[PDB]
Design an enzyme around this catalytic site. Structure first.
Site, PDB file in Angstrom:
ATOM      1  N   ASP A 110       0.828  -1.193   0.000  1.00 19.77           N
ATOM      2  CA  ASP A 110       0.000   0.000   0.000  1.00 19.77           C
ATOM      3  C   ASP A 110       0.874   1.258   0.000  1.00 19.77           C
ATOM      4  OD1 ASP A 110      -1.691   2.227   1.877  1.00 19.77           O
ATOM      5  OD2 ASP A 110      -2.878   1.112   0.358  1.00 19.77           O
ATOM      6  N   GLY A 111       0.345   2.331  -0.585  1.00 18.75           N
ATOM      7  CA  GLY A 111       1.009   3.634  -0.531  1.00 18.75           C
ATOM      8  C   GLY A 111       0.102   4.647   0.124  1.00 18.75           C
ATOM      9  N   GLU A 139       2.501   4.324  -4.085  1.00 18.96           N
ATOM     10  CA  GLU A 139       1.965   3.023  -4.506  1.00 18.96           C
ATOM     11  C   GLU A 139       2.942   2.239  -5.393  1.00 18.96           C
ATOM     12  OE1 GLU A 139      -2.015   4.839  -5.901  1.00 18.96           O
ATOM     13  OE2 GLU A 139      -2.391   2.903  -5.026  1.00 18.96           O
ATOM     14  N   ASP A 165      -5.296  -3.494  -4.400  1.00 23.56           N
ATOM     15  CA  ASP A 165      -6.455  -2.636  -4.596  1.00 23.56           C
ATOM     16  C   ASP A 165      -6.070  -1.336  -5.297  1.00 23.56           C
ATOM     17  OD1 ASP A 165      -5.171  -1.119  -2.623  1.00 23.56           O
ATOM     18  OD2 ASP A 165      -7.017  -0.605  -1.585  1.00 23.56           O
ATOM     19  N   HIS A 169     -10.717  -3.299   2.000  1.00 25.94           N
ATOM     20  CA  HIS A 169      -9.970  -3.973   3.007  1.00 25.94           C
ATOM     21  C   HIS A 169     -10.563  -5.324   3.534  1.00 25.94           C
ATOM     22  CE1 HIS A 169      -6.751  -1.375   3.177  1.00 25.94           C
ATOM     23  NE2 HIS A 169      -7.046  -0.682   4.260  1.00 25.94           N
ATOM     24  N   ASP A 189      -1.548  -0.819   4.702  1.00 34.23           N
ATOM     25  CA  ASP A 189      -2.168   0.498   4.775  1.00 34.23           C
ATOM     26  C   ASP A 189      -1.739   1.188   6.079  1.00 34.23           C
ATOM     27  OD1 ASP A 189      -4.140   2.782   4.775  1.00 34.23           O
ATOM     28  OD2 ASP A 189      -5.155   1.537   6.182  1.00 34.23           O
TER      29      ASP A 189
END
Length: 153
Positions: A9-10, A47, A69, A123, A133
């Site tokens: 995640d970013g 990301e 995602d 999530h 995250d």
């Protein structure tokens, strides 16, 4: 265990601002966690960095599953990068594609492995993704690196 699994995640609230990334690499019989904070960056750059760091930790050709995602990354892979490469990493106006440095770095890393992309949604039912995250948000609070390739506009 058969395939490497990478989760990413970013996070970055500003445009640009302090940002970070979290990545979980499940590799051999182990789990490795990567995370860092950048002083002046963007969400999208964060990301890409999360994939870049986890992929580059692999020292041989692997089978990799990339559950993500990220819409930016998804569009890049499924829609943009094919054309971009044909065009020499330019958009229709003949300018350098946005974040070209990280896209090329990422493409070079993917080019080492048998990559399986899984595009997923919220999530719920993705605990690794939710932990990335949490990692990315924490790093953004405490940025210590320079995002060297970031360019305005």
């Amino acid at each position: 265990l058969k395939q490497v699994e990478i989760f990413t995640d970013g996070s970055c609230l500003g445009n640009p601002g302090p940002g970070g990334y979290g990545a979980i690499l499940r590799y051999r019989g182990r789990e490795k966690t990567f995370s860092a904070g950048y002083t002046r960056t963007t969400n999208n750059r964060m990301e890409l960095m999360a994939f870049i760091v986890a992929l580059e930790a692999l020292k041989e050709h692997c089978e990799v599953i990339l559950s993500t995602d990220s819409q930016y990354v998804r569009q890049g892979i499924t829609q943009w990068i094919h054309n971009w490469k044909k065009r020499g990493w330019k958009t229709a106006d003949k300018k350098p594609v946005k974040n070209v440095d990280l896209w090329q770095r990422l493409d070079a890393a993917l080019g080492q492995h048998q990559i399986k992309w899984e595009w997923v949604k919220g999530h719920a039912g993705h605990p690794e993704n939710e932990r990335c995250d949490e990692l990315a948000r924490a790093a953004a609070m405490n940025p210590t690196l320079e995002d060297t390739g970031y360019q305005v506009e």
